[PDB]
Design a protein around this motif. Structure first.
Motif, PDB file in Angstrom:
ATOM      1  N   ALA A 125     -22.190 -12.168   4.422  1.00  0.00           N
ATOM      2  CA  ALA A 125     -23.023 -12.731   5.478  1.00  0.00           C
ATOM      3  C   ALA A 125     -22.177 -13.505   6.475  1.00  0.00           C
ATOM      4  O   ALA A 125     -22.439 -13.472   7.683  1.00  0.00           O
ATOM      5  CB  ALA A 125     -24.107 -13.627   4.879  1.00  0.00           C
ATOM      6  N   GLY A 126     -21.145 -14.198   5.989  1.00  0.00           N
ATOM      7  CA  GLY A 126     -20.255 -14.908   6.891  1.00  0.00           C
ATOM      8  C   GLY A 126     -19.425 -13.993   7.766  1.00  0.00           C
ATOM      9  O   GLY A 126     -19.190 -14.296   8.940  1.00  0.00           O
ATOM     10  N   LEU A 127     -18.972 -12.864   7.219  1.00  0.00           N
ATOM     11  CA  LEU A 127     -18.099 -11.977   7.983  1.00  0.00           C
ATOM     12  C   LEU A 127     -18.871 -11.137   8.992  1.00  0.00           C
ATOM     13  O   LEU A 127     -18.333 -10.803  10.054  1.00  0.00           O
ATOM     14  CB  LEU A 127     -17.310 -11.066   7.046  1.00  0.00           C
ATOM     15  CG  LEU A 127     -15.815 -11.372   6.979  1.00  0.00           C
ATOM     16  CD1 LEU A 127     -15.591 -12.845   6.673  1.00  0.00           C
ATOM     17  CD2 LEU A 127     -15.131 -10.489   5.953  1.00  0.00           C
ATOM     18  N   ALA A 128     -20.118 -10.777   8.681  1.00  0.00           N
ATOM     19  CA  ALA A 128     -20.925 -10.054   9.659  1.00  0.00           C
ATOM     20  C   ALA A 128     -21.154 -10.874  10.918  1.00  0.00           C
ATOM     21  O   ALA A 128     -21.413 -10.302  11.982  1.00  0.00           O
ATOM     22  CB  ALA A 128     -22.266  -9.652   9.048  1.00  0.00           C
ATOM     23  N   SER A 132     -20.540  -8.821  14.344  1.00  0.00           N
ATOM     24  CA  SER A 132     -21.453  -8.646  15.465  1.00  0.00           C
ATOM     25  C   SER A 132     -21.279  -9.732  16.515  1.00  0.00           C
ATOM     26  O   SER A 132     -21.707  -9.543  17.658  1.00  0.00           O
ATOM     27  CB  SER A 132     -22.902  -8.624  14.976  1.00  0.00           C
ATOM     28  OG  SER A 132     -23.529  -9.878  15.172  1.00  0.00           O
ATOM     29  N   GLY A 133     -20.666 -10.857  16.157  1.00  0.00           N
ATOM     30  CA  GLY A 133     -20.378 -11.896  17.123  1.00  0.00           C
ATOM     31  C   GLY A 133     -21.506 -12.884  17.336  1.00  0.00           C
ATOM     32  O   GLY A 133     -21.259 -14.070  17.573  1.00  0.00           O
ATOM     33  N   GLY A 134     -22.749 -12.419  17.239  1.00  0.00           N
ATOM     34  CA  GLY A 134     -23.874 -13.222  17.666  1.00  0.00           C
ATOM     35  C   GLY A 134     -24.667 -13.931  16.586  1.00  0.00           C
ATOM     36  O   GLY A 134     -24.164 -14.851  15.935  1.00  0.00           O
ATOM     37  N   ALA A 135     -25.912 -13.494  16.384  1.00  0.00           N
ATOM     38  CA  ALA A 135     -26.900 -14.315  15.688  1.00  0.00           C
ATOM     39  C   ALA A 135     -26.970 -14.010  14.194  1.00  0.00           C
ATOM     40  O   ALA A 135     -27.183 -14.914  13.379  1.00  0.00           O
ATOM     41  CB  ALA A 135     -28.275 -14.125  16.333  1.00  0.00           C
ATOM     42  N   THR A 136     -26.820 -12.739  13.820  1.00  0.00           N
ATOM     43  CA  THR A 136     -27.056 -12.323  12.441  1.00  0.00           C
ATOM     44  C   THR A 136     -26.152 -13.049  11.453  1.00  0.00           C
ATOM     45  O   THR A 136     -24.941 -12.818  11.413  1.00  0.00           O
ATOM     46  CB  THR A 136     -26.860 -10.813  12.286  1.00  0.00           C
ATOM     47  OG1 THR A 136     -25.462 -10.517  12.204  1.00  0.00           O
ATOM     48  CG2 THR A 136     -27.464 -10.072  13.464  1.00  0.00           C
ATOM     49  N   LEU A 162     -15.430  -3.202   6.472  1.00  0.00           N
ATOM     50  CA  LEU A 162     -14.941  -2.867   7.806  1.00  0.00           C
ATOM     51  C   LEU A 162     -16.090  -2.702   8.791  1.00  0.00           C
ATOM     52  O   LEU A 162     -16.034  -3.215   9.915  1.00  0.00           O
ATOM     53  CB  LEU A 162     -14.097  -1.595   7.761  1.00  0.00           C
ATOM     54  CG  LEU A 162     -13.641  -1.101   9.136  1.00  0.00           C
ATOM     55  CD1 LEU A 162     -12.731  -2.121   9.789  1.00  0.00           C
ATOM     56  CD2 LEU A 162     -12.946   0.245   9.043  1.00  0.00           C
ATOM     57  N   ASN A 163     -17.143  -1.989   8.390  1.00  0.00           N
ATOM     58  CA  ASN A 163     -18.252  -1.736   9.300  1.00  0.00           C
ATOM     59  C   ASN A 163     -18.940  -3.034   9.693  1.00  0.00           C
ATOM     60  O   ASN A 163     -19.348  -3.212  10.846  1.00  0.00           O
ATOM     61  CB  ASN A 163     -19.242  -0.775   8.654  1.00  0.00           C
ATOM     62  CG  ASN A 163     -20.477  -0.569   9.493  1.00  0.00           C
ATOM     63  OD1 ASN A 163     -20.435   0.095  10.524  1.00  0.00           O
ATOM     64  ND2 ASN A 163     -21.588  -1.139   9.054  1.00  0.00           N
ATOM     65  N   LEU A 164     -19.063  -3.963   8.745  1.00  0.00           N
ATOM     66  CA  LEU A 164     -19.645  -5.264   9.056  1.00  0.00           C
ATOM     67  C   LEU A 164     -18.758  -6.042  10.013  1.00  0.00           C
ATOM     68  O   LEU A 164     -19.224  -6.559  11.033  1.00  0.00           O
ATOM     69  CB  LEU A 164     -19.856  -6.061   7.771  1.00  0.00           C
ATOM     70  CG  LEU A 164     -21.176  -5.885   7.036  1.00  0.00           C
ATOM     71  CD1 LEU A 164     -21.399  -7.079   6.142  1.00  0.00           C
ATOM     72  CD2 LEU A 164     -22.304  -5.740   8.018  1.00  0.00           C
ATOM     73  N   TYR A 165     -17.467  -6.135   9.694  1.00  0.00           N
ATOM     74  CA  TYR A 165     -16.539  -6.918  10.498  1.00  0.00           C
ATOM     75  C   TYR A 165     -16.329  -6.332  11.885  1.00  0.00           C
ATOM     76  O   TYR A 165     -15.835  -7.034  12.771  1.00  0.00           O
ATOM     77  CB  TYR A 165     -15.208  -7.038   9.749  1.00  0.00           C
ATOM     78  CG  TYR A 165     -14.007  -7.388  10.595  1.00  0.00           C
ATOM     79  CD1 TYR A 165     -13.232  -6.396  11.181  1.00  0.00           C
ATOM     80  CD2 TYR A 165     -13.629  -8.709  10.780  1.00  0.00           C
ATOM     81  CE1 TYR A 165     -12.132  -6.709  11.943  1.00  0.00           C
ATOM     82  CE2 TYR A 165     -12.528  -9.033  11.542  1.00  0.00           C
ATOM     83  CZ  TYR A 165     -11.783  -8.028  12.121  1.00  0.00           C
ATOM     84  OH  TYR A 165     -10.682  -8.343  12.880  1.00  0.00           O
ATOM     85  N   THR A 167     -18.821  -3.916  13.626  1.00  0.00           N
ATOM     86  CA  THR A 167     -20.038  -3.643  14.377  1.00  0.00           C
ATOM     87  C   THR A 167     -21.264  -4.377  13.867  1.00  0.00           C
ATOM     88  O   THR A 167     -22.369  -4.099  14.348  1.00  0.00           O
ATOM     89  CB  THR A 167     -20.352  -2.141  14.385  1.00  0.00           C
ATOM     90  OG1 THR A 167     -21.092  -1.806  13.205  1.00  0.00           O
ATOM     91  CG2 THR A 167     -19.084  -1.324  14.430  1.00  0.00           C
ATOM     92  N   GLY A 168     -21.119  -5.300  12.925  1.00  0.00           N
ATOM     93  CA  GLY A 168     -22.292  -5.831  12.268  1.00  0.00           C
ATOM     94  C   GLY A 168     -23.031  -4.705  11.578  1.00  0.00           C
ATOM     95  O   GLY A 168     -22.483  -4.079  10.666  1.00  0.00           O
ATOM     96  N   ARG A 169     -24.249  -4.411  12.025  1.00  0.00           N
ATOM     97  CA  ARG A 169     -25.060  -3.333  11.463  1.00  0.00           C
ATOM     98  C   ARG A 169     -25.225  -3.513   9.955  1.00  0.00           C
ATOM     99  O   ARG A 169     -24.915  -2.634   9.151  1.00  0.00           O
ATOM    100  CB  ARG A 169     -24.457  -1.967  11.788  1.00  0.00           C
ATOM    101  CG  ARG A 169     -24.483  -1.599  13.253  1.00  0.00           C
ATOM    102  CD  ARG A 169     -24.003  -0.174  13.453  1.00  0.00           C
ATOM    103  NE  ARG A 169     -22.628   0.002  13.001  1.00  0.00           N
ATOM    104  CZ  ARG A 169     -21.964   1.153  13.056  1.00  0.00           C
ATOM    105  NH1 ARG A 169     -22.551   2.236  13.542  1.00  0.00           N
ATOM    106  NH2 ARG A 169     -20.715   1.219  12.622  1.00  0.00           N
ATOM    107  N   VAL A 170     -25.734  -4.691   9.582  1.00  0.00           N
ATOM    108  CA  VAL A 170     -25.800  -5.068   8.178  1.00  0.00           C
ATOM    109  C   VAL A 170     -26.770  -4.198   7.392  1.00  0.00           C
ATOM    110  O   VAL A 170     -26.871  -4.340   6.170  1.00  0.00           O
ATOM    111  CB  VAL A 170     -26.163  -6.560   8.058  1.00  0.00           C
ATOM    112  CG1 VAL A 170     -27.664  -6.756   8.116  1.00  0.00           C
ATOM    113  CG2 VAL A 170     -25.578  -7.153   6.790  1.00  0.00           C
TER     114      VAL A 170
END
Ligand SMILES: CCCCCCCCCCCCCCCCCC(=O)OC[C@H](CO[C@@H]1O[C@H](CO[C@H]2O[C@H](CO)[C@H](O)[C@H](O)[C@H]2O)[C@H](O)[C@H](O)[C@H]1O)OC(=O)CCCCCCCCCCCCCCCCC
Ligand SMILES: CCCCCCCCCCCCCCCCCC(=O)OC[C@H](CO[C@@H]1O[C@H](CO)[C@H](O)[C@H](O)[C@H]1O)OC(=O)CCCCCCCCCCCCCCCCC
Ligand SMILES: CCCCCCCCCCCCCCCC(=O)OC[C@H](CO[C@@H]1O[C@H](CS(=O)(=O)O)[C@@H](O)[C@H](O)[C@H]1O)OC(=O)CCCCCCCCCCCCCCC
Lengths: 189, 180, 68
Positions: A125-128, A132-136, A162-165, A167-170
């Motif tokens: 949760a911290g790395l996403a 994504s940079g923003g709110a999630t 990698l996908n989280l770090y 593009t987010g897209r959790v």
């Protein structure tokens, strides 16, 4: 479409006989041991619907054994010595004491694994967030449960990190890990 | 059968006699140091009157080698199974006659033990020709000598069974009895 | 001497911890009667009619019944 006669929109993937017996009926997919005689769910069904307990017993023990567990190899004829020592050459009392110790150890191991899974969900949760940079700040309960039941291969969790770090897209998760078949070589093992 | 072994062994022995007789110039006769330093042909070299003799012996050995190879790969079906009965004569009689010559060789006092490439294949092929006369004389089935093996094995078995039951341990003691 | 006795004592304690056959399932390569396993059955001779009598008290000798 290599198939001359019939080719449905989904390609045919061959099916083969299983190679190992399924988990019993009683065990959880996790590391914690079971209730050791009666599962807890047996209490919420009708008495006339719990024949599946003893039926599953009859199946795993005598009736549906996959012909891959009855292969005679050079490895199995020494594992026979080991198992026969354990079952005929040891008194049941020492076996019982070892059983209790092993149960306790496995309970502690499960507690440790659960703590580790929770810490992993925090970290992801911290790395996403960076990703994504923003709110999630969110994670997926799907991935927490799949981690607690050992349903992911290591490559899958790496690709997910990698996908989280990046593009987010959790909510985009690796497909699933498939069951490992029973290794066979030849008359060897 | 032992006919095939006979002829193929004559092949091998004659071809090796050729390969060792046509590839080397000549052996040397021992000097016998101090043997009449004058006459009596001692302490000399071999003559040009025997090298051609050796080559003629080798050529005859090769001709009979090829003859044996022909007979062997012809009668391997043992096309003519019975025509060779003529050359049978030629293949055996002279051979025996050959030996006769060599059997009178110690009488003439000719020395055959010192040299290698001359009388070795001589006595070999001569005795092998007499032995082919035997193979045609008693007609070893290739399973009859095996029958003699079995006969002597059965006799010795009956000897050791008696020896056991008499001097080691009684067969009535060793074997289990039943009904009780 | 103490060590060389403690070995036997440990083995004896281990054999004591067994205490019986509870935990031991049946086995077909090893019946409990040696006669079945060894294929032993009487024949015709040596059969006395009143030998059965003797048989009984021998059983009565070991089934511990002091009547005999
Ligand atoms: C110190 C405590 C040990 C005391 C004792 O009595 O020490 C000796 C014990 C043997 O204990 C025996 O343990 C037996 C355990 O039996 C139980 O378990 C058995 C299976 O082993 C059978 O199932 C039996 O029916 C069941 O009652 C009974 O309690 C006997 O009465 C008791 O003598 O061995 C041991 O601790 C094991 C020795 C390990 C040495 C290596
Ligand atoms: C640690 C041991 C590594 C092997 C673990 C494999 C576990 C696994 O499932 O991997 C995860 C995936 C396998 O993926 C599995 O594939 C299966 C197909 O039969 C099923 O589809 C499973 O669901 C899927 O998880 O691994 C890979 O894709 C390859 C990984 C290579 C690992 C070996 C590395 C060691 C090689 C060193 C040699 C270097 C020489 C140069
Ligand atoms: C000499 C040895 C030469 C071996 C060469 C290297 C072999 C490499 C090891 C083989 C892979 C293990 C196979 C497997 O796990 O089978 C399942 C086996 C039991 O064999 C199984 O056991 C089953 C009966 S049961 O499980 O014991 O009840 C039975 O179905 C089956 O016949 C029998 O195979 O499970 C074990 O517990 C094996 C664990 C130990 C193996 C690692 C030790 C390395 C040696």
């Amino acid at each position: 479409t290599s198939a001359p006669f019939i080719s449905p929109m989904t390609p045919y993937v061959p099916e083969e006989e299983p190679t190992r017996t399924p988990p019993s009926i009683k065990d959880t997919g996790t590391l914690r041991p079971a209730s050791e005689w009666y599962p807890q769910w047996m209490q919420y069904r009708r008495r006339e619907d719990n024949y599946v307990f003893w039926q599953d017993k009859f199946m795993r023990c005598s009736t549906d054994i996959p012909w891959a567990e009855k292969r005679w190899t050079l490895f199995s004829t020494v594992w026979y010595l080991v198992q026969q020592l354990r079952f005929v050459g040891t008194p049941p009392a020492l076996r019982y004491v070892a059983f209790l110790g092993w149960r306790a150890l496995m309970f502690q191991v499960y507690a440790a694994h659960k703590a580790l899974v929770l810490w992993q969900c925090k970290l992801d949760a911290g790395l996403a967030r960076i990703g994504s940079g923003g709110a999630t700040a969110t994670f997926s309960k799907t991935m927490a449960l799949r981690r607690l039941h050992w349903r992911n291969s290591p490559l899958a969790e790496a690709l997910y990190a990698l996908n989280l770090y990046k593009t987010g897209r959790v909510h985009l998760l690796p497909p699933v890990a498939k069951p490992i078949p029973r290794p066979t070589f030849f008359w060897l093992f | 059968t032992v006919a095939g072994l006979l002829l193929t062994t004559t092949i091998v022995v004659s071809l090796y006699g050729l390969f060792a007789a046509v590839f080397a110039p000549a052996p040397a006769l021992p000097v016998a140091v101090g043997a009449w330093p004058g006459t009596a042909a001692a302490a000399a070299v071999m003559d040009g009157s025997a090298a051609g003799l050796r080559r003629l012996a080798a050529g005859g050995l090769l001709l009979t080698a090829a003859a044996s190879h022909g007979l062997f790969d012809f009668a391997g079906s043992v096309p003519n199974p019975t025509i060779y009965s003529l050359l049978n004569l030629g293949f055996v009689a002279a051979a025996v006659l050959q030996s006769y010559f060599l059997y009178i060789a110690p009488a003439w006092g000719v020395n055959v033990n010192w040299d290698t490439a001359l009388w070795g294949p001589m006595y070999g092929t001569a005795f092998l020709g007499l032995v082919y006369g035997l193979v045609a004389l008693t007609k070893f089935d290739w399973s009859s000598v095996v029958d003699a093996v079995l006969r002597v094995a059965c006799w010795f078995a009956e000897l050791t069974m008696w020896f056991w039951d008499t001097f080691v341990w009684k067969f009535s003691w060793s074997e289990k009895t039943r009904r009780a | 001497a103490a060590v060389a006795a403690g070995w036997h004592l440990a083995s004896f304690a281990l054999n004591l911890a067994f205490w019986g056959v509870e935990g031991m399932p049946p086995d077909r390569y090893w019946p409990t009667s040696p006669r079945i396993r060894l294929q032993i059955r009487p024949g015709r001779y040596g059969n006395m009619d009143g030998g059965q009598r003797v048989y009984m008290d021998y059983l009565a000798r070991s089934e511990g019944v002091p009547l005999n």
